[PDB]
């Protein structure tokens, strides 16, 4: 479990991803949630930043990722870095 939000980089009160082997953690506000998830929750690294479909290409520095239809510099990283 990472100790800093994968979206914003800072620490504090973080929620953890339930996908198998995902160590990524997030603030609620950085995800657009007001309360902790109420069942199995998968974090945004796993789904396309455009359409929400399962992602195939992944930023290693933040949860931006894209599916085949919508997919970066070089580990690969997106614009924010
Ligand atoms: Na994503
Ligand atoms: Zn955050
Ligand atoms: Zn995850
Ligand atoms: Zn997509
Ligand atoms: Zn990124």
Residues 6+ apart with CB under 8 A from 38: none
Residues 6+ apart with CB under 8 A from 32: none
Which helix (H) or strand (E) is 63 found in, with range? none
Instruction: Give the distance (Å) from ligand 5 centre to CA of residue 34.
Output: 24
Instruction: Give the distance (Å) from ligand 1 centre to CA of residue 68.
Output: 12
Name the structure determination technique. X-ray
Q: Are 61 and 78 in contact (CB under 8 A)?
A: yes
Write out the E strands in 1-81: 15-16, 25-26, 57-58, 65-66
Q: Are 11 and 30 in contact (CB under 8 A)?
A: no
Ligand 3 ion: Cβ-proximal residues, 5 Å cutoff: 17, 19, 22, 24, 43, 45
List the one residue out of 18, 49, 43, 40 whose CA is nearest residue 28.
43
Structure tokens belonging to residue 22? 């995902």
Residues 6+ apart with CB under 8 A from 46: 19, 22, 54, 55, 65
Q: Are 72 and 65 in contact (CB under 8 A)?
A: no
Rounded to whole angstroms, the Cα distance separating 57 from 69 reads 10
């Amino acid at each position: 479990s990472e100790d800093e939000c994968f979206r914003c980089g800072d620490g504090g009160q973080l929620v953890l991803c339930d996908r198998k082997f995902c160590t990524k953690a997030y603030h609620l506000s950085c995800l657009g949630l007001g309360k902790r998830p109420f069942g199995k929750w998968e974090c945004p690294w796993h789904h396309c930043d455009v359409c929400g479909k399962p992602s195939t290409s992944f930023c290693h520095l933040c949860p931006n990722s894209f599916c085949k239809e919508h997919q970066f510099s070089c580990r690969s990283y997106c614009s924010e870095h």
